[PDB]
Amino acid sequence: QSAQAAHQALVEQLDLHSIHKTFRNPNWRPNQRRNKTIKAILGESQTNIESAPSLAPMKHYCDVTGLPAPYLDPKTRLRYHNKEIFAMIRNLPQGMGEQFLEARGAHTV
Amino acid sequence: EPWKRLPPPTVYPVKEARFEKYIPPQLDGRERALAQPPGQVAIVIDNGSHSVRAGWNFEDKPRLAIPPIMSKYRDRKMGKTFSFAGSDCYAARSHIRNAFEAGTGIVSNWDVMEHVLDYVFVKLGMNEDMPIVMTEAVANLPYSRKSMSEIIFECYGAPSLVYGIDSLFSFRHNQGQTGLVVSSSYSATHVIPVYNRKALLSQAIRLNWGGWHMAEYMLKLLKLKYYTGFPGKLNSSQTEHMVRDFCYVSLDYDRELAGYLDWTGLEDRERIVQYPYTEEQRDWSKSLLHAFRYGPRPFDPSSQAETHRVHLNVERIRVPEVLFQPAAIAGVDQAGLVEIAGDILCQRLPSLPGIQDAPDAFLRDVFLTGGNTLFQNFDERLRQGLMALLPVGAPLRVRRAQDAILDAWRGAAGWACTEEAKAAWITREEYLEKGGEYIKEHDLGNA
Ligand SMILES: Nc1ncnc2c1ncn2[C@@H]1O[C@H](COP(=O)(O)OP(=O)(O)OP(=O)(O)O)[C@@H](O)[C@H]1O
Numbered sequence: 001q002s003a004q005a006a007h008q009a010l011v012e013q014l015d016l017h018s019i020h021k022t023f024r025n026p027n028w029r030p031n032q033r034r035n036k037t038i039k040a041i042l043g044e045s046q047t048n049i050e051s052a053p054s055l056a057p058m059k060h061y062c063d064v065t066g067l068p069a070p071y072l073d074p075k076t077r078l079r080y081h082n083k084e085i086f087a088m089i090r091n092l093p094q095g096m097g098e099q100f101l102e103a104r105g106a107h108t109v
Numbered sequence: 110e111p112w113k114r115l116p117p118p119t120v121y122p123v124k125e126a127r128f129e130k131y132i133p134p135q136l137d138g139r140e141r142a143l144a145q146p147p148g149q150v151a152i153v154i155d156n157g158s159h160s161v162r163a164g165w166n167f168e169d170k171p172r173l174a175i176p177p178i179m180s181k182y183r184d185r186k187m188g189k190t191f192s193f194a195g196s197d198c199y200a201a202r203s204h205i206r207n208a209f210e211a212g213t214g215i216v217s218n219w220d221v222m223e224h225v226l227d228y229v230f231v232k233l234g235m236n237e238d239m240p241i242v243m244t245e246a247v248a249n250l251p252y253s254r255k256s257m258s259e260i261i262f263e264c265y266g267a268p269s270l271v272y273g274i275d276s277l278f279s280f281r282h283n284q285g286q287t288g289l290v291v292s293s294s295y296s297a298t299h300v301i302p303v304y305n306r307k308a309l310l311s312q313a314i315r316l317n318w319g320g321w322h323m324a325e326y327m328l329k330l331l332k333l334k335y336y337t338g339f340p341g342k343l344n345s346s347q348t349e350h351m352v353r354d355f356c357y358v359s360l361d362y363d364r365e366l367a368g369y370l371d372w373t374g375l376e377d378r379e380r381i382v383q384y385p386y387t388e389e390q391r392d393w394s395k396s397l398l399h400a401f402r403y404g405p406r407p408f409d410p411s412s413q414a415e416t417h418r419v420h421l422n423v424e425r426i427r428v429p430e431v432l433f434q435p436a437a438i439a440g441v442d443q444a445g446l447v448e449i450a451g452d453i454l455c456q457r458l459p460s461l462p463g464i465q466d467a468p469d470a471f472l473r474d475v476f477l478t479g480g481n482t483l484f485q486n487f488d489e490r491l492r493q494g495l496m497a498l499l500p501v502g503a504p505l506r507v508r509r510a511q512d513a514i515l516d517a518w519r520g521a522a523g524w525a526c527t528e529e530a531k532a533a534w535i536t537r538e539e540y541l542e543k544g545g546e547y548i549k550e551h552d553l554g555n556a
């Protein structure tokens with residue numbers, strides 16, 4: 001069917017593997033280990049000393065609705081706006097509480 | 110009555126990254142690159158983690174703007190291998206890998222990068238021999254620079270290479286002379302003080318928040334808002350278009366936030382995104398969580414049209430504000446943009462011994478670069494935040510770059526073949542002796 005033929009035409013038209021690169025040196029071949037993560041690079045190097053913490057007191061926002069939160073729930077440690085969201089928070093599925101923490105990089109353990 | 114008085118909702122379709130058209134190789138550019146005078150032609154590549162931009166230094170705009178992604182697979186029924194290296198990855202298998210480590214400015218998958226460079230030179234019409242100008246992350250890692258320059262010299266054999274910072278090329282293109290360069294990009298947000306056209310990179314600071322993190326955070330929020338299950342497949346490419354089209358910086362966040370879900374006028378503050386669908390005495394009207402999730406209208410799960418739509422609400426303004434309140438809103442545990450810029454102007458630069466007329470020299474041009482600065486009220490928010498930290502009546506101006514995405518490439522294109530640049534070029538024969546970590550230190554580059 002023409003739709004499949006057209007899609008295969010586009011796939012062949014777009015592919016780079018069908019194209020020979022005269023500008024590419026065939027003799028050089030990379031080290032297969034060359035792909036390394038930042039932690040590996042920094043750990044092996046041991047200026048990415050440009051990050052900075054803050055000392056000011058941070059504001060408190062509701063983990064559910066993002067509105068300001070007067071309250072921190074001592075049980076689930078979610079911050080919440082009002083009693084309606086406290087009801088929602090306590091009714092959450094057993095996995096969901098850790099997701100609200102984790103959306104702000106917090107975790108319960 | 111409280112909803113029946115409202116008009117039918119205005120609703121916006123989802124947008125996503127997609128393949129648009131075939132781009133044949135631009136052989137006309139290759140011919141011009143041979144006709145132009147000796148030593149006044151270079152290939153200029155901006156390594157955007159969101160978009161690799163590449164073209165001819167003698168031209169006013171890049172020839173390519175391409176995501177740094179590859180795809181490589183076999184149609185096993187067909188036996189032939191296929192490979193793709195940009196928006197030819199349909200970002201229809203979407204069997205994709207990316208050159209950059211996600212949420213960083215550093216290239217890390219060099220096989221992907223090498224396939225992206227291969228795509229670039231094919232599309233520029235290489236028939237091989239041409240100087241290359243390539244942008245870097247600030248404080249780009251030596252190993253990453255070594256690996257890129259090894260690819261440029263060993264694989265592609267190019268005659269010369271120079272590395273400069275994208276935000277500093279952007280500043281030069283906007284008549285930058287001295288100033289505070291504030292960049293927000295895909296990877297990160299940086300504040301760079303520039304003195305007498307030279308960046309004081311020892312006083313640069315990085316936030317580790319950017320347009321990537323905003324699209325990822327917006328996705329975490331939408332997954333939480335609809336944790337009962339949104340029936341459409343939420344993707345980070347979709348939330349990236351949501352952050353562009355709908356988010357804005359709040360001029361007074363807590364004042365605006367605390368009333369944001371208030372029921373009157375919520376149909377104005379709310380914007381509604383339609384995912385695609387197919388179809389054959391306390392109550393909701395006084396519940397906050399209905400407003401949050403479904404707005405002023407009643408909701409029914411029977412409608413396939415009214416399911417499969419997300420209501421943005423507080424994340425319209427909550428998402429950009431992570432730049433200003435990172436530890437509060439997203440736990441980033443880093444100083445906000447106004448506190449970083451304030452620390453530089455007020456604490457660092459007046460102490461620095463070689464500088465004169467600090468802060469006022471720098472303070473007269475706080476310069477905004479990179480796409481993730483393009484939020485509404487971003488500039489006014491940064492101005493009013495700094496104005497409180499500076500002495501009264503200090504000559505603060507905040508200024509946007511022209512065309513704050515492409516302008517970083519235009520600066521490198523204009524700079525590419527100046528005598529200042531050609532003194533910074535490294536030749537292949539130097540690289541073979543000095544190695545790939547060595548660079549000519551220059552005002553637009555790393556130390
Ligand atoms: N009008 C706009 N408003 C807000 N954000 C925008 C707008 N246009 C683009 N963006 C966002 O800006 C980001 C692109 O940033 P930029 O082009 O400066 O980065 P880059 O050069 O590709 O990356 P980097 O320098 O971090 O490696 C993307 O997240 C994109 O969604």
Ligand SMILES: [Mg+2]
Pocket residue numbers: 156157158275276294295479517
């Ligand atoms: Mg950039």
